[PDB]
C-alpha cells in the first residue's frame, strides 16, 4: 500500500482504453496511406475494367460468324482503344488485357488457331466491363486499417487523397539524476539512459511520430518544465523514471497539483511494473494522455506494450486495439507469482507441430537467454492459484504478440 490503491490488471488496461481519446481526421495522399485508418468510405469513380478486356490473347471474334477462315482488319494492343470496327466476316488480333473491338462477341485461345481451329462458345474468355468493380460501389469501408493491398485499391479506384484519423505524436522523456546520454563516457555514480532509446524505438516500430524530450532530473521544477513542452508538442507524454518509494510522489505530485492532471491509477497488480502510472489532462477540449512508466528497463518495455501501444492504436481510430493473443506451448518450467507475470519470449512454429513454442528472453538486468531472433511476443503467466503453483514445459499458455511474428 502507498498513497495509491492497487489497481486490477484488467481494470488498469480497460481504463487506459476507455480514458484514451480518438484523434481527429486529416487528408493524406494515398501513398502515405500505409498503416492508417479510413475516416471515409471510398467509392469507385468508374467501372473496372472500363472496357471488355481479353482474358486470352489471339483473335476477337463474332459468335454468329462461327468457324472458318476470315480476313483481319487490324490489331488491338493493350494500350489504346481500337478505331476499327468489326463487321460480319472479319476478325481482330488481341493481347491479354487488350480491349475487345466494337463488334466482337468473344475470343480465341492459343493452340486453337487466319487459320481457325474452332468449337464456338460466346463470352469466351472476356473480362466484362465492370466485372471486378462497378462505378459507384463502395470499395473500402470507413474504419478500415489500410494495408499495402488497400493502397493498391485506393490507386485502382483513383482516389488519391483520403480522410484518415491522424497518428498521435508521442513525446518521451526519462527522469533521474543518475542518467547520462549513452554517447557520453560513463562518469562516476551514473548509469546510462537505457529506456528512452527502447521506448522511442518501440513506438516508431509502429510508425507513430516521436518527440525526444531527453533526460530530466528528479526534481519538480525541471520535471514540470518537461511535461509542459510535452503537452505543448505532442498528444501522449511517456515518462520512464523509477518512481516507487520515498519520492514516488515527486512526479505524481507535479501532475496532480501543478498540471492539474487526473491520475486514473498509480499502482497495478502485475509483474513487472507495479508502479505504473496512467493519467489524463484536458487543455481546451483536447485530452492529452500521460503514462509514467517505471525505471526498470524491462518493465519499461513490458508495460509500454501492454498499455501505451493499445492506447496509441485506439487513438489512430483502430477499431479493436486489443493486442493479438495467441496460444503457445511453454519451453521451460516457470514459478508462478502472486501477481500476473509478463515475460518477453520468442515464438517459434516448428516445421509442422500445430502450436508454436515460446522461450523466455529474461527476467531482469539485460537478458538470460541469448538469441538471434528478437522478442516475438511476451508471455502472459497467470497469478498462482490455490491449486496451481508452476507451469511445466509443454503446457499451453497465452502470449500477447509484440512484433512482426
Amino acid at each position: 500500500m502507498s498513497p495509491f490503491p492497487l489497481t486490477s490488471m484488467d481494470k488498469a488496461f480497460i481504463t487506459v482504453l476507455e480514458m484514451t481519446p480518438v484523434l481527429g481526421t486529416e487528408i493524406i495522399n494515398y501513398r502515405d496511406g500505409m498503416g492508417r485508418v479510413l475516416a471515409q468510405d471510398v467509392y469507385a469513380k468508374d467501372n473496372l475494367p472500363p472496357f471488355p478486356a481479353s482474358v486470352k490473347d489471339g483473335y476477337a471474334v463474332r459468335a454468329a460468324d462461327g468457324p472458318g477462315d476470315r480476313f483481319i482488319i487490324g490489331e488491338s494492343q493493350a494500350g489504346e482503344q481500337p478505331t476499327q470496327t468489326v463487321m460480319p466476316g472479319q476478325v481482330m488480333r488481341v493481347t491479354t488485357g487488350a480491349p475487345i473491338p466494337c463488334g466482337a462477341d468473344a475470343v480465341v485461345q492459343v493452340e486453337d488457331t487466319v487459320r481457325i481451329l474452332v468449337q464456338a462458345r460466346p463470352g469466351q474468355d472476356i473480362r466484362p466491363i465492370g466485372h471486378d468493380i462497378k462505378r459507384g460501389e463502395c470499395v473500402l469501408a470507413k474504419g478500415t486499417h489500410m494495408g499495402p493491398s488497400e493502397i493498391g485499391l485506393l490507386a485502382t479506384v483513383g482516389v488519391t487523397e483520403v480522410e484518415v484519423n491522424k497518428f498521435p505524436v508521442v513525446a518521451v522523456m526519462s527522469t533521474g539524476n543518475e542518467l547520462l546520454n549513452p554517447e557520453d563516457d560513463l562518469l562516476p555514480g551514473k548509469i546510462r539512459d537505457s529506456n528512452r532509446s527502447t521506448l522511442l524505438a518501440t513506438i516508431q516500430e509502429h510508425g507513430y511520430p516521436t518527440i525526444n524530450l531527453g533526460i530530466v532530473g528528479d526534481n519538480p521544477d525541471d520535471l514540470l518544465n518537461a511535461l509542459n513542452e510535452g503537452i505543448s508538442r505532442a498528444d501522449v507524454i511517456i515518462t520512464s523514471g523509477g518512481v516507487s518509494m520515498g519520492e514516488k510522489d515527486y512526479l505524481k505530485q507535479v501532475l496532480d497539483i501543478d498540471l492539474h492532471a487526473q491520475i486514473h491509477f498509480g499502482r497495478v497488480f502485475m509483474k513487472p511494473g507495479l508502479p505504473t502510472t496512467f493519467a489524463t489532462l484536458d487543455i481546451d477540449g483536447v485530452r492529452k494522455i500521460i503514462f509514467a512508466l517505471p525505471g526498470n528497463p524491462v518493465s519499461a518495455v513490458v508495460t509500454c506494450n501492454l498499455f501505451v501501444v493499445p492506447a496509441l492504436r485506439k487513438m489512430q481510430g483502430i477499431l479493436d486495439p486489443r493486442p493479438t493473443i495467441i496460444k503457445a506451448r511453454l519451453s521451460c518450467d516457470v514459478k508462478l507469482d502472486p501477481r500476473p507475470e509478463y515475460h518477453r519470449c520468442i515464438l517459434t512454429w516448428h516445421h509442422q507441430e500445430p502450436l508454436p513454442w515460446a522461450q523466455s528472453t529474461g527476467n531482469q538486468m539485460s537478458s538470460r537467454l541469448m538469441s538471434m531472433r528478437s522478442a516475438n511476443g511476451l508471455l502472459m503467466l497467470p497469478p498462482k492459484t490455490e491449486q496451481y503453483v508452476e507451469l511445466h514445459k509443454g503446457e499451453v499458455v497465452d502470449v500477447m504478440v509484440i512484433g512482426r511474428l
Binding site: 497467470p382 499451453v396 497465452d398
Partner: peptide, 5 residues
Amino acid sequence: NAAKK
C-alpha cells in the same frame, strides 16, 4: 494451464 490475459 490457467489463462490470464
